[model samples]
Structures are given as structure tokens and as C-alpha cells.
Target: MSKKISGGSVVEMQGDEMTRIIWELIKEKLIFPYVELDLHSYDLGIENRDATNDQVTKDAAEAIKKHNVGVKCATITPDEKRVEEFKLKQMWKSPNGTIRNILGGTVFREAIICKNIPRLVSGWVKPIIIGHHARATDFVVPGPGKVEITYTPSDGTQKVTYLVHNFEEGGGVAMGMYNQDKSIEDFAHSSFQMALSKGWPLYLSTKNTILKKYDGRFKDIFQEIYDKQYKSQFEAQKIWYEHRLIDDMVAQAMKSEGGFIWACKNGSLGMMTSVLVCPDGKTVEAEAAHGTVTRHYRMYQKGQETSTNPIASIFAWTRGLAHRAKLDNNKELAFFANALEEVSIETIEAGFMTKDLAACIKGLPNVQRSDYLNTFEFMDKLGENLKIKLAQAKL
Candidate 1:
């Protein structure tokens, strides 16, 4: 229908090595062509961070706050050799850590599952979810929209904002909610991460339909990150994640053979997704979980082929864009985001996988050369898949 779509602002953070390369690949191949975004770029690349004493991350964090949505690629967190390799004035903190400190929220991770893989749950054929308020962030309610709160210093000029709940985690829908207020963000991060690690789906419940509260009505923050961070992990797992009104989720819970995860935080870092959710719950910065695959990048450097899994990096993009979609009420964008994610899961379900995932099914020790695609072909393979789905009927 509409190409070069309009009306959303996104904070885009760049990172290091292979994921960095894949970020561009995803952007060019899957993202940019479908819905042209008002995507802001932050070069958190190690060189730039060193050049600016890493203020680039802060600027990016502020931009995320301004826009309410962000996506990122993995950046080196810095070590003696990393510092030695980059060779700069001094070592820098994690770029996202700078953003995380500024954003001030907990991380939420969710599991991605596939029927072909193994899991810790028995009847959890669907996935149970978690969100611990005693934990960063939600309940469950739907139909979209923001919140998270921050602090204000009595002595200084301006210090914080307020956030409660939002629905901006873009996939196939649009909404805004945040991972702010340090605690809830952590709760949600833990919730999602546990889910991902568990290889189960998750459902976040809230009361948007009847309440006059932030968390009560906030639905998107979880969606925002799930689409961005957890989508691919779940895809890799051949499992999935979603949101439902508390009313619906509870009912769904009793009516089925469960294989999922659920949450009500105000959460857990369930592992599949990484977002630095500020207390405000509206502003966040996210990248894929884990560090840059230095070994894989090194191998690729010598003109050797590597099976670097770009899933996590793609998760970063999907998360950021999901927030962008949710914040701007960018449904088309969410559809695009979700569709992109779908193929990520979809591709694997059809039996194609990267080395990491192949190892899961076939055993790392016995992984066949024919089981997974190399990095280059895997990238091209996803590109091929996303376009066909887009051409088919739009998610």
C-alpha cells in the first residue's frame, strides 16, 4: 500500500563488528525499503565513543528520551585488549550502559521457541510469562500507548520525568509503554529473559480497559521490547511471545495446555531482549543481548566464512522499531516490524538456521556443514524471506 511511510521518529544506535555489518544488512534489506523512518542514527561504534569520550551514548540516550523509541547494534564494552585494539585515550564504559544509567530501567528478556527444540516446561506448550513489580515494569491490556517516571533533584535544574505503562514495542501493532523506574524495568527484563532462556512464550496482563492508571493501562513497553529484543530469540526457539488483557490472559490460561510465561511487574530480564528502560517506562535504549562475536569477526576478517548469528542484532532493530511503531501509533510499521520478525522465526521453522541454532537441534558437536547457512547466505536468505512475505499481503 504505502511505501516510504511517514510520521515516526526513532533513535538508532550503531555498534561494532559483525552485528554492525548485519545491522546495515537488515536496514537495507528488510527495514528501509518498506517504511522509510525518521530514524536518528547514533554512532556508538567504539571509535566514535573513544573520540567523544563516549558522550555519544548520552546524546543517543537523550534522543531516545525525546523520541520514546530506540534500536541498537552491539558495541564493544571495552577491555584491556579491546582498549589495546581500539587504542584510544582511555577505556569507555558500555555505550548502552551509559544509556542504561541515563535511562535507568531494568532489563527484560523473553524466550523464543520452536517446536523442534527442547525446553524446561512440560505442558507449557504455549509459554508462561512473568513481570515482577517487586521487580522494572506491566499487567496487560491492549489497543496501544506511554509511561515511566524519573527523579528530580531539589538542587539542580531538571532531573527526571514520570512513566507508568506504554505499548510501543512494535511488531505488527503499535503502542507505547516503557521500562523506566529502574525497578520495574529490571523486573520486566528478568521476566522476559527468563522466558527466553526457558524457551517459552510470554503474556503480559494489564487493565487498560477499566483503569485510570499507568501500569494498569500500559501495554506497549513489553510489546516494544518483545518485538525488538525477544522476537528473534523466540523465533530461534520456535516459540513466540504476545500481550493480552488480564481478563483474556487469565481466561486463556485456564482453557489451555500451557507452555508459556506471564508477567505483571512494574519484571524480569527474561535474556532474549535487552532494553535499558528508564523509570519513566517510556524511554528506552536496546541492543541485542551478549557482546560482539569477536572471534567470528576475526575469522571473517581473514576472508574466512563464519556463521555469525545475526538474530540478536536483528532483535535489537526489531525492538527499537517496535517502540517507534508503538509510540507513533505506526501500525503499518508494526506490521512491518512483526513481519520482519515473523520471517526470522518463520525461516527457522522452515528448517533453515544459522550455526548457533543448528547446534541446538543437531548437537553442536555433530553439527553438519549442511545444517546451517553461513553468515552471508543467512543474511541474504532472510532478505529473500522478508520481501516475499511483504509482497504477499502485508502482516
Candidate 2:
């Protein structure tokens, strides 16, 4: 069958470990066979990164900047131990961090929901995407000191400074920070765009009660943007944006039937599988949430059967391709992406999944080797199901 992608290309950032194994298998089985994709590929493996003095990572970032979309496999961010294991060169930084620095945007971490997968949060029937502003700079102050923050006009007007804290009394530390209006504006715009795309309400969560000036500004900015620009459109779509106290937001989120976007300042940190909304608005980088699966890779290397779930890795491809389809106005490609996702979900629902999902469905005690497919077997099942789904779509 002729593939659907007829034009623009997406950069492919390859990674390490068992996921890299599945990455190639996924393309071979599910992607290349049905879609004629133009991929500008870059190997972001640790060895490659070290071999090129981390130049390969930069080259991949540049390619994504040029192409506007890239799908990445999970890669390792070497720590001292990993550096020793890999042997050679300095500890390379996280590729995602490097990519985000180059891209500059907000990252929204979302959990993919499937009906059969038993969720501990019963209220979460749908997906509740969490948006985290990613442009914040963090710092730590050392020793006893008083910290002051001042803003002076570029024209050299007299500066008024506020006493942030006096460490002399308690012998502690203080750190001051600021955010540009443009950064806050981009975050607000990204949240609204995501909510509109999903036709779901948007909530900006902050600790305005305590840090009234800092958090309050965030709330006010979102409100102003919504009132002036998105209110009518949001209301028209039966969706809205509201500022919620962080405490209240968590409480409400826990018990609520999910279908909203919660925008939190710097929330995406320490999370996996995040979707970044670039400043350009046209570019996106879909990547796995976690690092290289070292343990799983170890087993695979030992020729032992491994049942690692590749859902997030596969979604990285689907999400990136879906964005490409949106950019190119290719309905067929969009349907293909959605179909592939649906098939993956339904396959799990059908009681055929990897060990991780199997454990979620039936408690670990009840889970047996027969309950799930190994990595290779699972992808084969997914590919088989995808082909069946695509063929049925033709009718």
C-alpha cells in the first residue's frame, strides 16, 4: 500500500537501551511499512554523544529547529556511575534538557488513559494533562546573607529595591527570581491552545494565597489573557479557564472526572514523557518520559525474555506524526496515527499487554509470565492489531 506522508520531514532522535531496540522494531513493523516518512535521523546514543563531544545532540536539536517536529527514543543522561560504565569523556547532560534549551517552551505531561487499565484514581476516566512552565531559572543561595531584588528601568532611572529576606538574623540563605512578561505570556498562550485543541477547561494552579505577589501575577496574567482573548472562544466551546489555589487544585483533581488541562508553574520537572510546546507554536518534540531502561537492557543483553512496556515510546512516534499531519493537513496520516494509538490501547484492553500493564490490570501477585507478552511478542501483537484496524478502516 502507498504511504500517506507525501511531503515534509521530521527529525528522528535515536537513543539507547531496550527502548532503542523497540524503536527500530516499531519503525520496521508499524511505521515504514505503511507511511512514507522522510526522517532526518540523528543517533543520540551515549557513545555517539561522547564520540562527537555531544555535538550529535546539538545537531539533532538544530534539525528539529529546521524541521519543527522530532520523535525521540529514551536516552541515558550519564551520572558518575554511568560515566564509569560507559567509560571515557565527561558526563554528558540530558539530551531532553539540551533540546528544551534550544526549543524554549512549556512542557505538558499527560498520562495516556485506556479503559481496561485499572486506574487507582477512579475519578480519572479521561486524561488530565498537566502543563508546567519550563522557562524558569533556578538558583540556590549559600551562607548567611540578605537578598534584595530590584528592577531598574533600562533608561537608568532610580531603582527601588525590596528586602527579600535578611539572613543575618537567622543565618540562612535566600534566593530571588523574576520572570519576563513574555515568558508568562507564552505559558498562558500554550495552556489556552492545548485546552482549545482538546475542548477541555483550563485551570492555572498557583499558591497565590502565600506568595500573593509572585503567584498572584501568574493568576492575573492568565485571567487577563482569558478574559480578553480566550473567554468568548472558551465559553463557545463549553470550556473555561480559572485560577485555583495549588492545594485546592490537587484536591479537586483527585476526585474529579478528568477532562481538563491544569497549568502549573514549573510542574513538568521530575516527570517523564512530557510534550513541549515551543515558542514558535509550530514546533513540538515528542519524547519518552524516562531514561534508558538499563535493567531491561541488561536482561535483553543476557538473552533473557524481557517484558518492558513500550507504550510511551510508541506514543512518542504517534504524537510527533500526528503533529506532522496537522501541519501538512494530511487527514489520512492523522487517522493513521489515531488508529495506531487506538489499536495499542484496545490491545491492552483485550488482556494482551506487556508485564507492566499486566501488573496494573491484575495485581502483581496474580500476574504470571503467561499474562503478558515479552517486548518482541507485544510489538508483534500491536503490529498485527494495527494492520487489522487499518484494513477494517478501508471498508
Candidate 3:
């Protein structure tokens, strides 16, 4: 009998409705057999959420923070309609939001690229992972209610009134925040540090034109961080960091080859990213920027026939395992991560994918009606292929 090493502990948050069904299938098909999974499972299913008064979500987030690794399945963020539909005691906010608030972390989404999957951005021949650090934009109002908004020009003393409100409700918050020379500095250090670790250029975007005081502060701080701490390190790594206007960063990402980290959080809820830990204690987090396969899952289940993409989810496991392996400095574990990811990309690029991807590739590698894999079945195939790949790479 071969003695196997233990994988790191992972807190898995399960979610509601259709996704709940997908979660079971995902675990059964993709996760369990490959490694001895030590899953700390939390049921974030809507029913259980209501039963627990949604305390489960908070506990789960704490678990992720405690362990520092989490793989999350999509959960339904309930609204008024859902509350009525489910016959709940009260409407609940997004479980994701609750967890995110508790975790004090950002969600970064990376697109899973399979050669067969055609992206709207034609220039991206490879996968471009995008991460949004939630903590960076972490800001709060000085005081609540009866407030006036004003802005002052950078160079001197021209002040302008932006808005006036007295104890307003439901309007998103806007207030004066002075980044402690410490917090601003920490944010910059984390951004540059993360960028260097990945060997990717780091770009921080802000509305420097508007909200000059607030956003401009971010740009200036990161610039200071880059110059003082990261510039030499970045140059040494031959990777780089730059601050850009928000619009320009998107254009730059659109045209560039697929390696770099674009941090987007200040303006909007941007993209989805997941972190995974492998059997050998390696961890990887993949971005959920591409395929929108989850969209397809939603559509098809609604009796609207459509195709689904599996790249992001597939990469989730691989990337998590890769990071785990790397963290543990376990060569075999690292190779498994690489192999698992390669099998996924290779399998997809070799013209084996669902219909959504068919629409992407200029219709040349038209997925034969039989070639496409059902979401659940595609995961099964990946698992089977992963086992074979691992065997081949076995020491």
C-alpha cells in the first residue's frame, strides 16, 4: 500500500437551488476521487440559511479566513422576489456579501481559456486572470446623517460643492476618508507584493479625473509604494507596475498577451475569482472571468436550450492544487497541478467542448452535436482524464 500525504484543510461553502444540485455533482464527479479531500463543508443552501437565520454564511466565512483558503460554489443572493418565493421570515442579503464582509478579502475572477473556447476579446490567445482586492477600496464615512459633500482642487484651495443631504437613506455612501499614512501604505505594499509574486505587471485604476481627492490618493499611494518598495524588485523580476486611468487599463488588457494582474474594485463589482488547495498542501485560486458557463447553466435549467463553458470551474481545482503544492514545496504535487490544468486546456482545445464555445471559434471547429460535454459529464471526463494524467506523471 502506498502511503499518501495529507492535503490541506479547505472550507467549502455550499449554496442554493440549482447551484446546490450542481455542487453535489461537482464534488462527486470532480473532487473526491483524485485526492483524499479534507472538506470542511458548510451548507449555504437557502433552506438551511433560513433555518440558521443565515448565521451559517458568517461562520463559513470565518472558517475560510481561519484556514486562509476557500473554494466557493455560486449561491443565490436572495432578493424580494426570492424571499416571497421561498416563504422566508425576512429577506436576506447575499450570502456572498455577508461572507465577503466577514472575510475582509476581495474576490478576483479569472477566465478559463481553452483553445476551443472563443472569447469576445479575440486577442486573448491565453487565459488572463483578473483579481480584485476588496480591502484596497475599504473606506468609510466620517459621520452619519446631515452631511454636505465638497471637493477641493489638488494644487490649491478652490472648493466645490458636490451634493447635500440630510439623513438620507439608500443612497450609496460618499464621505471624506484620510488614509492613515499606514493603511494607504499597506494597500500599496500588498498590491505590489502580489504582483511581484505572480511575475505579472500590476495596474491600479481610479477615477483620477473625478473624486480626485479620494481616488487620486490611491494612485499617488501606489506610485509611492512602487517607487519606494517595488520598482527595484519589479525590475529585478522584469515584471512591472503602473497606475492608469480605469478605461485605459481595460484597453491595455484587451490587447495584451495573457499575463498580468488587473485590480478592479473601487467602482463596481467586477469579476469572480476562486482559490483552491490541493492534496499536497498546494493552493490555487482561479478567476471566474470567462465562459459565463454559469449563465448557460441558468438558461438551460429554465427550459431555454443553451451551451455551457467549464473552464473556470475546472481551473479552480487545478489552480488551488497548484498553489497548495507550491506552498508545500512538494514537486510531485506541483506537477499534478500542472498536469491537471494541461489536461483541461488540452482537452478543450482539441475540439471537445459544449455549444457556447462552438459560437466562439468562428464556427470552424464546430462541436459536433455529440462532441460537447454536458456540464456534469464534462466534469466527470475531466476527473477521469485527471486520474490518467496523474498516473502518467506519477513518481
Candidate 4:
């Protein structure tokens, strides 16, 4: 077998704190050692962002758009405390927020699955994926903040009340919305297409009935896109997308199996993965939904135990470009993504994992330090896996 290894660009946005430490290690271990990738690196660190007056984020976003593929390390979204700590110009903006503003893409956060890592809800024997739209920003005041709705009666009386920011009262109309018709369409297409590609039934969850106009837009647009473009194909493939209330969808997703694409939008912030199962029964790029835990590395300097999950971040890079590989009909890229993902999971399943995942499984007799690889070790293991994958391709 001959391998056709083609190369493109991986534009990276580097950031602050612990994730940055993991970023460098991940590259040195996992990415650089494997198939030669043309990397366009940009330092989006806080000091750099301040130095550039936050122009770094814009440049990085443009690069991702230019390359159609980007893997980002987590950065600090500056708060008042961060602002004071950094002591910089004009309260620096969030690098992620800035990038998202420019990219205008939907963020789907899928959980990292390690058989040993117990979830809060153990009933989720299957992968209970979560999705969030731009709602983090689409809502009135993102962050740990508040929203106040003011009303003026015809009788010239003014009334003010705080809404969704706090749980003042339940069962009232308190909704936060942020959606671009374009972004939502891409999200829908990505989800429905993901389902169709995987032969999994798709369900979109939204609280549409309450926020008739706001959340309803998401529901309507997704439906419109589905009916217009995907319905026939979805049905023909025996895979379908249906709208469900948020509460119901979460429950349904929890009970599901390892298969199926759960399109979740508009809740929480984290990293994600993309698991694509083709008609040929091959899973493509089931990568982590987040990244390497850099903070934990920093903590190690202080001799403290840190909890870091590199799974999602790794997957973001793998999926973002792996999809590009699929489009280019590059089996090498597909195999590389698959092999990397497998290696990561296998390392954990084999009882070789970071401290956090270790606690999840409790005591497994005869698990050794050799069996328990650190972040760097895991990256090296991935590299070894890639070498084999490459050799297999060469054969």
C-alpha cells in the first residue's frame, strides 16, 4: 500500500495560563512528532494581546478562516480581577469571544469519554453530548452577569426587574438569545449532515415555545434548513432530525448509545469533539472536545495537583482539519485522526491516564507508573501510533 500524504496549514491561537503549558507539550509530543503539518502559529497570550491591543485575536480568526482549519489552546477571558492582575490597556477583551465574533461558527461541546472516568450522571452509559450556540454572547450579558428588563406602562409608571441573570422566579419568560441566521444555518447543516453521515437520528433541543420569538428563531431556522435541504436525504438515509424541548432532549440524549450526533447549542463553555461514522462503517476523527490541561502543569510548579482534560482540545484540532481531509479524499489524514483518537482512548482504557481520570476508575490492581503515562507520555504514545499508521499506509 502506498500512502498519499498531503499537507495543509494548521493555524493555532495560543493563549494564557495552564492551557498554554499543555499546548506546547501537546505539540512537542503529539502534533510535531506525527505526520509533518505546516503550522502557522500566532501568540494570542494575554501580554501579546495587550501589546497588540487585541489585534492578535483578529489576525488568528482571519487565519482560521483562510485555512478553514484551526486548533486553539484555551485563553483567559479577562475579568475585573484579570484586568487588575495584568494591569494593561483598556480592559483586554476575551480572545475566544473576539475569535468567535469573527468566525461566526457554532460551538459544540462534546464530553470526553474514558470508560474509567465516571460521569456525574452514570446513567449516561452512552455519550450524552451537549451543544451551545453563540448564546454565550447572543444573550444580553454573557459571563457571570445580569440582564434587566425595564417596562413603562401607559399610565406613566416605570418598573424594572432583573431576569435570566438570576433565578429570581421560576416559570416566567426569561430567555437569552444570540443567533445569526448564517451561524444557525451552519450549525444546523453541521448537525444534520453529521447525523446523516453517521446514520444517527438527530434531535435539536431548544426552549422555543417560551421565547416564541428568540429561541423560536433557532427552532424555525433549523427546521427551515432541514425541510429545505436535508429532509429528503435524512429520511432516505433512515436518519432524521426532530425538534425537542431542551429538558426532553437532554434526557433522551443521556439514554442513547455511543452512536449518533447530538447537536447541542447554547449552554456552557468548553471544548468539543467530532465523531464521524461513514457509510463504510468507519469512524472518522472522534477527537477530544477540549484541550491539554495547561493549568495543571503550572500547578505542578507549585507542587499541587491539577485537574486537566486535554481530550476536547485535541479533538477540536483533529476534527476541524480531519473534516478537511475527508473533503480532500485524503485517507492519510482520516487515518491519522482515527489513529490519534484511538491512541488517546486506548492509553486511558489500558489504565494509562492522568491523575484525574485515575481517580475515576478507583484502584485497579497492578496499574503501574509505566502504565500511567503523563501528558507528555500520552503524546509520545500517540506519536508511536501514528508511526505505525504511517507504516501501514506505506505498505
Best by TM-score: 2
Clashes of 2: 2
Q: In candidate 3, what are the lDDT values of residues 1-395, reduced to their tens digit?
A: 14444566766766554444555665676555555656777887778889999888888877766665566666666778778878889788887667656644334456665555556576777555455544233334445556566768798779887554664553344445444656456556655555664577887777888878778778887787678766898889888787788878778777777677776545011122454222122222233333223455567668865444445555555566555566567676566567766787777766666555554554646646675666566666777776777666655
Q: What is the lDDT of residue 147 in candidate 3?
A: 59
Ranking by lDDT: 2, 1, 4, 3
Displacement of the residue 266 alpha carbon in candidate 3, Å: 4.2
lDDT of 2 by residue, 1-395 (tens): 34555535989988998889989998999888888868799999889899999999999988888898899888888888988998957987888889988888788887788777765577688788888885234456665676778878888868888887767655455555667888898898888988876689998888888888988789888888888888999989877788888887888888788889999874111123568877567888898786678888999989899987888888888889888988889898888889888998899779887887777767879988988899999989998999889877987
Better of 1 and 3 by lDDT: 1
Which residue runs of candidate 2 sit more than 4 Å off their true CA positions?
1-7, 135-151, 154-159, 167-170, 266-272
lDDT head-to-head 1 vs 2, winner: 2
Please write out the lDDT profile of model 1 over residues 251-325, one tens digit for every residue: 677667666667764311112555554544566566776677778889989999898777767776777777667
Worst 10-residue lDDT window, candidate 1: 265-274
TM-score of candidate 3 relative to the true fold: 0.75
Report clashes for each candidate as comma-separated counts. Answer: 113, 2, 16, 22
Residue-level lDDT for 257 in candidate 2:
84
Cα lDDT of all candidates, in order? 0.69, 0.82, 0.61, 0.62
Candidate 2 lDDT (Cα, 0 to 1): 0.82
When 3 and 4 are scored with lDDT, the better candidate is: 4
Ranking by TM-score: 2, 3, 4, 1
